[model samples]
Target: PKSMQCKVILLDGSEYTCDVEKRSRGQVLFDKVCEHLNLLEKDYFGLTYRDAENQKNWLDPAKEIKKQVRSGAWHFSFNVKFYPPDPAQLSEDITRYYLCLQLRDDIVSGRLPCSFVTLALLGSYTVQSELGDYDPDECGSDYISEFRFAPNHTKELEDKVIELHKSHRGMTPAEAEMHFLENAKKLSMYGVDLHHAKDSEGVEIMLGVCASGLLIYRDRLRINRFAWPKVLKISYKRNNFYIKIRPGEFEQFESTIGFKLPNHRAAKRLWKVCVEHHTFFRLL
Candidate 1:
């Protein structure tokens, strides 16, 4: 057959299937999906696939699909590649909706940890947006049972969600969505993406890139943060990545922090992610 069938899982957990020529490239398939959704703000989204080595890679827009994706493996996920600092700044409601879906998934996967109270509040708003206003006659007490809100779903959490849902009795879906973003954005791990690396002292740590700046995490705890304004330059050589920081008050010279990555590819990937995030969130 000259045509191939591919399935793309959307951020909202829906499946989109399409057929393309065998020689088609990644951009061709991406464009078809965006056209189907009528998405204009396409830069924030990308398609990702896992290779045989269990490494996730973004589909290169300029590369051939067959060359990148192994034969007979025709599955990809449509995800938010670069998360905006404040999702409210997004111009389209549809874009916000997808971001919400991604955040919901993050909560479920334990990637975005939240306190019990924050989880309840976010869950309540999610229910309001999905099921509309709470109606006693049409809704059962177990209405929230159908949705998975967090990694640790408990009766206590469910009760909290129900209690909070009662207060949002008249909020429209759009309003509920706004509330969702407003609360979710305040979370510490909202848009932070972590990469495994070792610090200059050979101590294991996580290098995180987000809207605000570079974050250093040791043992899953954030110990240091360098805001975008303080970062002067970022570069990598071989397996080493470097961050140049502007001198602090009382300091005369700038300092450069370096970290060692596992391999040259890992080093370059971290540098590229840092550059893209910096450009998207920091630059005009």
Candidate 2:
């Protein structure tokens, strides 16, 4: 039995129990992916997980890393963020518009699954520009809404995921996300140009990010999803449905149509992850 001593144990209230290999290649692969992607870096792909109650009471960040080294079962949330290239060159109408399309496609087709924003900038080398363009304080927009949406029902969440699950087909999660985003704008007293169509990407990006900025925080001004070490779980029962965020190799498990999330934040946060395992690489 000494040779089989387990470092990680999972109990599912019912009879489901699992003993995992912490040092297995699966864990090694996980580390490789994170480093290769520069996920731990600040500014672009970084995410922070905090404990409930207050931000100051954040959990031990080191604990997850240690836990990751041992054999066990753990859950995590995914978040992806894309930003206007540094040095502030967003004024290039063609490039900016193209990014708009790319981002929308990512959303409609369930690409990046977090609250997102695209700011206006002139690119770092431009001399006429002021300092700190990419700095969170200087990088901002006068048009567009940052992306926003929440999964109240199982179907709503499935839509934002990498694959639009069957349960989310009937409703417009995109439109609903827009509405919630607008509310944040009005509440924060940010100027809103109501003349544009609600579906217009520019208006959507502007209002969306404003709302996102007011309600969120992290390396990027517009990300509101979870990080790995702080992942939460959905349990007690199974609905027996899952969609692939990434195909035939790595993994990410999505909840089915009837899965009950722990709370509203948990529900929304879990569902909106941009699921990295889905898109292997990015051109952006």
Candidate 3:
């Protein structure tokens, strides 16, 4: 069987070249790519191809490559197919690798907005991944002379990157990636990967479901918090999102706070985020 060449494109526009035998299956090709990337959680990502009609679908890894590509098109893109409800559920290092990639992109695109302190911290991690471990003894200032960050492109941001970079001296790429994810996951907007919705006040907020419970935030401020043990019940209606919290030990007051979104669709999307978070973070 003749081997055909293929290119695996990442969301960041970086590409990796590989080849697959005509008789090989999609899983075989996927393994080949994983080998090249040295991915930790190999199962988190899959190869997807666009049909002649342009409909995108994941390759059935068990099926032969030739059968799926009668037209002789040998192109595929590697991307995350499942967004874990909780990052903690991810079991392999490779899964976090892709999540880190998503985090870096979102920070650049303003999807993950935060305070200058938080921005500086995350930017430093990105720099660590690209520029290698920091080196005070090996000319540090010479490294970030031209660095810039998106959404908040300013010298202050570059300075933050430089300052944080010094602290990351002697770290490995995997260590750098891990720090990026651990810190990013702690942000209230981490679950923005699933859904992000605003509250009645028109302030954009993120509802993050993790081991703690329901985490609410507006920009960089975590304005509201509800621990799983204190959560009485959660329900939603047309355009209303409601959560009932158990009253404190000495309190005589009990109430359900409801937040209204622009429409029922928006309300329900937020409700789903709440439900998923509640299940994952609470049970585990």
Candidate 4:
């Protein structure tokens, strides 16, 4: 079957094909036909871009995605056989971000087509400022929502590996079969795919949401952009688990697991639940 990109055949036996590009060269694309129902644009994302000169701009990724979903926007889609290569890998990220958010509003709309990002998270953000281009002093908090997949019936959010596509998107051909009369141990949900380039290094964790302390994680770190009362974070380990609520939403790490050591059975159960329902659980 066709993967990564799609192919088409006209009335004649001739064919036309297109492929989604990786992040390195910058050009990215969204194939309308191939990525229809569950199609995620993966580009045209929204963000507050903070430049070196302290200028901030609001980016819009969902304008079109929303338009498509509503079917009431002023502009029509690129209803042709071709489209230009996208602006950059940024294109796909923006696209999927809004796509998922839009999906949450209408869960039973059937699975909307989605996207894949090549080398989504191969890079890391250095904590120390002098060592990297990021502003180290910007240690405030941020609010971000991640868009990923999970089984329809997961129990918690934990380190569950997602079905990953390669740097370019494609499915693995191998399928394993075994014959054993062993009892089943357990079943769980989806989690972060740490091995995949996308989750290699965790996404930028939220620090705090303070009136004077706002941390935005765009391409880099910044301080005092938006005064958010909420934050969402996860551990450095790319395991499918609960997001660290920095603003004392749930049991604070200090209050709950403070003086006591992590119980073995508790840890085991927590791990199991996170694995089984990694994607289903949410803070809100």
- Candidate 4 lDDT: 0.24
Predicted model with the maximum TM-score: 1
Which window of ten consecutive residues has the lowest lDDT sum in model 2? 119-128
Candidate 4 lDDT, 1-284, residue by residue in tens: 32243243311224445543222111222333224323354222222223233322221222332322232211112211111122122234333323323322222222221121211111111011112232324322331113332223131211111211112122111100000000000101011111111111444432221122223332344422322223243222222323333445465452111111123333232333233222222211
Q: Which stretches of model 1 miss by more than 4 angstroms?
A: 1-3, 22-25, 70-72, 137-144, 219-222, 246-254
Q: Rate the local accuracy (lDDT) of all candidates.
A: 0.86, 0.26, 0.70, 0.24
Better by lDDT, candidate 4 or 3: 3
C-alpha RMSD of candidate 4:
23.1
RMSD of each: 2.7, 21.8, 7.9, 23.1
- List of clashing residue pairs for candidate 3: 40-94, 41-94
- Candidate 4 matches the true fold with a TM-score of 0.19
Please report the TM-score between candidate 1 and the true structure. 0.88
Model 1, range 169-277, lDDT digits (tens) per residue?
9898878988999999999898888888999899999888888889999865557998887988999999999999999999999999999998887787788778777
Question: Could you give candidate 3's per-residue lDDT for residues 1-284 as a string of tens digits?
Answer: 78888877876668888777778889998988878777867655678787655544567688887777657477888866444545656776667767777666667778667778877887788778777877567445444444345576776677777888889888777778778777787775554433355676766776665456666767554567787678877888987888888877888987787776666756665565566556655554
Instruction: Find the candidate with the highest lDDT and give its number.
Output: 1
lDDT of 2: 0.26
**TM-scores across all candidates?**
0.88, 0.21, 0.55, 0.19
True lDDT of residue 67, candidate 3: 78
lDDT at 125 for candidate 4?
Answer: 11
Q: Ranking under lDDT, best-scoring first?
A: 1, 3, 2, 4
